[PDB]
């Protein structure tokens, strides 16, 4: 099945998922000089005060921090969006070394990691219906650089030892995703896709300009996770990023001057 290796990685995905070669694939390189400021874009509204995290999962690709999305509890609105998008999960992509790991790039710069907060459009009722729509999802992407520790990340890091291998989950309640946001909500936005199979072209991307800082020790803990299941040959969970895809007929817009 698909993964990140030589024999199953991103260049192979098109054989099982032909949209991999589609017109609105993600990630992309953000050319800061050509992204145009759009004064019609609104500030982003991130309302995570009532978010209810439930569980962390090692799905064999990354780990997912899952939320209760059975009410409007943690919603994204504004920005480029029409209507209301409910938080369902977050996860990261990261490298083997600090010089790689992000999916989006900024003027070809790769960050050490990238966080994706995934939200679905409430007008379609559930996530599975939403991913069938061109405006079904809004993903907030946040870059990570290595420097000072992010105190709001440590609870995540803490738990990873308990979910080392594929298929392991653990209770993960009361985690506040606000502690993962940078100070500014300035962003770039463009229409794209999920960055893992099935690669559906259902996402409005909102990529924050300001990275968060995490410590080397925090990231090193991500790199101790395993892509394999229990008792199988160990293959470290690193380099679980899809490279930049062709921009094609798209515009990237900036919220800021």
Curated annotation (Swiss-Prot):
Phenotypic consequence of residue 64 to Q:
2-fold decrease in enzyme efficiency, as determined by kcat/KM ratio, and efficiently inhibited by chlorzolamide
Where is it located? Cytoplasm; Cell membrane
Name the gene for this chain.
CA2
**Variant or mutagenesis effect after changing residue 15 to E:** In Jogjakarta
Q: What is the effect of changing residue 103 to D?
A: Normal CO(2) hydrase activity
- What organism is the protein native to? Homo sapiens (Human)
**Site residues, Fine-tunes the proton-transfer properties of H-64:** 4, 59, 64
Q: What is the effect of changing residue 91 to Y?
A: In OPTB3; partial loss of activity
Q: What is the stated purpose of this protein?
A: Catalyzes the reversible hydration of carbon dioxide. Can also hydrate cyanamide to urea. Stimulates the chloride-bicarbonate exchange activity of SLC26A6. Essential for bone resorption and osteoclast differentiation. Involved in the regulation of fluid secretion into the anterior chamber of the eye. Contributes to intracellular pH regulation in the duodenal upper villous epithelium during proton-coupled peptide absorption.
**Catalytic residues (positions):** 61
Q: Residues at site: Involved in the binding of some activators, including histamine and L-histidine?
A: 89
Catalysed reaction, written as an equation = hydrogencarbonate + H(+) = CO2 + H2O; urea = cyanamide + H2O
Which family does this protein fall into?
Belongs to the alpha-carbonic anhydrase family.
Q: What is this protein called?
A: Carbonic anhydrase 2
Impact of altering residue 89 to P?
In OPTB3; in Czechoslovakia
According to the record, cofactor stoichiometry and binding are noted as: Zinc. Can also use cobalt(II) with lower efficiency, but not copper(II), nickel(II) and manganese(II).
Q: Where does Zn(2+) bind?
A: 91, 93, 116
């Amino acid at each position: 099945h698909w993964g990140y290796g030589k024999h199953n990685g991103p260049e192979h995905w098109h054989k099982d998922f032909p949209i991999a070669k589609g017109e609105r694939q993600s990630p992309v390189d953000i050319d800061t000089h050509t992204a145009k400021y759009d004064p019609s874009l609104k500030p982003l509204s991130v309302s995570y005060d009532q978010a209810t995290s439930l569980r962390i999962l090692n799905n064999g690709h990354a780990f997912n921090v899952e939320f209760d999305d059975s009410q409007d509890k943690a919603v994204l609105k504004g920005g480029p969006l029409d209507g209301t998008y409910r938080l369902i999960q977050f996860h990261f992509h990261w490298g083997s070394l600090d010089g790689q790991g992000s999916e989006h790039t900024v003027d070809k710069k790769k960050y050490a990691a990238e966080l994706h907060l995934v939200h679905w459009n409430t007008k379609y009722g559930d996530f599975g219906k939403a991913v069938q729509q061109p405006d079904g999802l809004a993903v907030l992407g946040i870059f990570l650089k290595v420097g000072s520790a992010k105190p709001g990340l440590q609870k995540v890091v803490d738990v990873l030892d308990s979910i080392k291998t594929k298929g392991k989950s653990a209770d993960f309640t009361n985690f506040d995703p606000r502690g993962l946001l940078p100070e500014s909500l300035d962003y770039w936005t463009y229409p794209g896709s999920l960055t893992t199979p099935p690669l559906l072209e259902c996402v409005t991307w909102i990529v924050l300009k300001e990275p968060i800082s995490v410590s080397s020790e925090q990231v090193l803990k991500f790199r101790k996770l395993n892509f394999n299941g229990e008792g199988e040959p160990e293959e470290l969970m690193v380099d679980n990023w899809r490279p930049a895809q062709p921009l094609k007929n798209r515009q990237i817009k900036a919220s800021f001057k």
